[PDB]
Design a protein around this ligand. Structure first.
Ligand SMILES: Nc1ncnc2c1ncn2[C@@H]1O[C@H](COP(=O)(O)OP(=O)(O)O)[C@@H](O)[C@H]1O
Ligand SMILES: [Zn+2]
Length: 700
RNA sequence: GGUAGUCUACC
RNA sequence: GGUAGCGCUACC
RNA sequence: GGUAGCGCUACC
């Protein structure tokens, strides 16, 4: 039974004409009800007319998959079979969706489905191409994520291949594309004309010409989704007395550690003067983010530079590692107070004490009691945060508080602080911390229930609770010195359906928030221009649509000419263990398989220790992995990668962070962060074949 | 960082 | 293990 | 616009 509202029916009109469209409506307006109605009309008209029908509904986050699948399925007759597909599944996708009418999927499942046929171990293993046009209608939930190299963008890439190459099979037609979103975003453009072009580009890439926007029933929409006021509350940042002394004394300690590096670089006769190429003087402002840019990029040079004396690499990597912890220590002092920041620093420094060098143990003893600095007052943001909690708890004993922070560790700290707060202890208010699941989901679900029952009344969370999760309506939303984009600004305040308040001690963070409100009104102005000058907008879409196919071909041509040139250079790279530098193999021995990079040198098995995973753990993991491999050399044991099952055979893949490249015939030490950087700059492994699988199955 | 445009000072 | 996006920042 | 670093989240 469908009791469709009036503004919802308005949002179905374009789609019900069979046209591609994007549905823009606030979060909580019932877009999945709109989709369910469109799927119903699509299924019934086409079934009665004898035409084929098959729906696909995609959403980026797999946690609201059963929720949105059950919702849509409930509005449809039982003759229509619905099926969820996701990474936790073990059966191939091709079979699961064979006789299903509604597929509910994460978009990568469809990317792999459509690209699965392009690679094979041999000609007999080849698969028939699964054409995206097998679906007659496709829904992009949160379609503002159709940008750059995203899964959604790669699904539209398949669409445009079919649209321009004319390879669709007999009877097929281009599917109807429907997008759902609360806001398409401004692309951080500065005026309406540019934002209109940006939106035209997004439409073009989805092959959309007509936006679906509530125009008549605007008042009915206001009632069903109110306007929440977003207040900003700037707080004082203390730099007086103990707090400034802790900062000043930790700054002097870092300058001494920076001297350990310089004394070492002098012995190598290396002259100091970007920080990933040249050795540079550290920035004077130690707590500025530009300092971490220096420490981290410099540490890449230390493992990518060939020294000449003994221990130079050891003392520098020891120094840079301490400076990282000092920078984070300064960062934790901004959000809290020197007690917490020193607690972190003491633990980190005590952990490394057994291994510290001579010079480093001397420096720490000279500052460990000095940095103490007795004790300082509570951070103004904490006290102001507590004040907001008490003000709501007096008005309502059923008070639900959720606090967004930036880092996982900051949630750990703020949680421990709020629980040890005397005024909250008496007032009967416990707090729990929550973070992202990707690196137990049941231990997290347990916290959401306790938060709903009222056992815990405060929830310190990272940005995980901004989308997807079913978090109960909260009385107060606090953004503890944290802000990001304008799309989350519309969906971070959208969780209040209640007051959201930004507590910050940074003007740059207040400005970032006010800019995101300007972007919100800039969207309104632009959407109005689009609605009221529809012909000009159509011309913008046509201009952008004219660019897509030649751009796709240019991109494909660039990839092929890049491989062509790499083959003409014909450079061989030695692949060594990053820790022990034992030669693991060469680039000629690497093969690729589902964007995994496998060693196909049979001698490689004798350089590693396999470590299998139990079938219990494998079922929980949402990708292909059977175990790990570790460097076999003595006193190394570095994890070099993982085992993946290829046609029943375990094969070893290499982690990019566990290896270093050497041009064959030189000592040139190339460091790499990701395999995609290797494919882009050095060599492109060819697809793994059946011969390679057998050769490694036997050698093992 | 590159380009286009404008301004200001100077031969 | 691989990949995607977002924020901030550094250098050109 | 390009080249990098950190943090966050997600996906296979
Ligand atoms: N017309 C309606 N009839 C019944 N329930 C509705 C209606 N519109 C919205 N809802 C309910 O509102 C809730 C949120 O809707 P949802 O589709 O998740 O919104 P969106 O996906 O646009 O954020 C759902 O539980 C849904 O059942
Ligand atoms: Zn090793």
């Amino acid at each position: 039974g469908l009791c469709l509202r009036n503004y919802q029916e308005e949002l179905c009109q374009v789609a019900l004409q069979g046209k591609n469209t994007i549905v823009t409506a606030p979060t909580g307006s019932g877009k999945t009800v709109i989709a369910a109605n469109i799927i119903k009309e699509h299924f019934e008209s086409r079934s009665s007319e004898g035409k084929r029908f098959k729906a696909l509904f995609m959403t980026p986050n797999s946690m609201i998959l059963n929720q949105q699948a059950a919702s849509i399925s409930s509005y449809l007759d039982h003759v229509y079979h619905t099926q969820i597909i996701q990474g936790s599944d073990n059966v191939p996708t091709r079979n699961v969706i064979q006789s299903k009418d509604l597929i509910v999927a994460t978009p990568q499942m469809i990317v792999n489905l459509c690209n699965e046929h392009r690679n094979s171990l041999d000609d007999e293993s080849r698969l028939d191409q699964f054409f995206l046009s097998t679906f007659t209608i496709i829904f992009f939930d949160q379609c503002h994520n159709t940008v750059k190299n995203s899964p959604y963008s790669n699904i539209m890439r398949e669409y445009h291949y079919l649209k321009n190459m004319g390879n669709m099979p007999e009877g097929h037609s281009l599917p109807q594309i429907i997008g759902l979103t609360a806001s398409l975003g401004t692309g951080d453009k500065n005026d309406c004309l540019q934002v209109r072009n940006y939106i035209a580009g997004l439409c073009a890439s989805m092959d959309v010409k007509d936006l679906s926007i509530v125009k008549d029933n605007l008042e009915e929409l206001r009632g069903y989704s109110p306007i929440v006021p977003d207040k900003v509350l700037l707080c004082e940042r203390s730099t007086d007395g103990p707090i400034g002394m802790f900062t000043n004394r930790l700054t002097l300690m870092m300058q001494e550690v920076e001297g350990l590096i310089r004394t070492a670089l002098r012995n190598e006769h290396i002259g100091i003067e970007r920080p990933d190429s040249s050795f540079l003087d550290p920035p004077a402002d130690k707590e500025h983010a530009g300092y971490q840019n220096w420490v981290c990029n410099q540490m890449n040079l230390v493992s990518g530079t060939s020294f000449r004396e003994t221990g130079t690499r050891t003392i520098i990597n020891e120094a840079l590692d301490v400076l990282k912890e000092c920078f984070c220590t300064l960062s934790y002092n901004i959000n809290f107070h020197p007690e917490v920041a020193l607690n972190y620093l003491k633990d980190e420094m005590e952990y490394r004490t057994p291994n510290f060098t001579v010079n480093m143990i001397r420096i720490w003893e000279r500052y460990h009691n000095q940095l103490v600095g007795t004790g300082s007052a509570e951070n103004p943001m904490i006290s102001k945060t507590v004040q907001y909690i008490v003000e709501q708890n007096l008005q309502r004993a059923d008070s639900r508080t959720i606090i967004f922070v930036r880092t996982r560790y900051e949630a750990t700290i703020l949680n421990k602080v709020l629980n040890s707060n005397e005024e909250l202890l008496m007032l009967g208010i416990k707090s729990e911390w929550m973070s992202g699941l990707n690196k137990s989901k049941q231990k997290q679900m347990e916290k959401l229930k306790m938060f709903a029952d009222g056992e815990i009344r405060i929830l310190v969370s990272t940005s995980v609770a901004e989308e997807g999760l079913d978090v109960p309506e909260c009385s107060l939303v606090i953004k503890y010195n944290y802000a990001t984009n304008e799309i989350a600004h519309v969906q971070r305040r959208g969780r209040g359906r209640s007051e959201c308040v930004l507590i910050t001690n940074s003007i740059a963070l207040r400005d970032q928030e006010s800019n995101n409100r300007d972007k919100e009104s800039l969207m309104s102005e632009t959407i109005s221009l689009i609605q009221n000058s529809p012909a000009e907008f159509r011309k913008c879409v046509d201009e952008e649509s004219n660019k897509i196919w030649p751009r796709i071909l240019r991109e494909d041509t660039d990839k092929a000419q890049k491989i062509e040139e790499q083959i003409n250079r014909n450079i061989v790279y030695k692949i060594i263990c990053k820790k022990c530098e034992a030669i693991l193999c060469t680039s000629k021995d690497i093969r690729s398989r589902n964007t995994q990079y496998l060693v196909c040198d049979p001698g490689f098995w004798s350089l590693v220790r396999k470590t299998r995973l139990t079938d219990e753990q494998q079922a929980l993991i949402k990708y292909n992995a059977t175990g790990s491999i570790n460097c076999r050399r003595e006193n190394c044991g570095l994890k070099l990668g993982q085992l993946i099952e290829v046609n029943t055979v375990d094969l070893p893949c290499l982690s990019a962070l566990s290896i270093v490249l050497l041009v064959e015939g030189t000592d040139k030490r190339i460091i790499v962060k990701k395999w995609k950087n290797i494919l882009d700059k050095y060599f492109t492994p060819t697809e793994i074949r059946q011969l390679d699988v057998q050769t490694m199955r036997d050698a093992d």
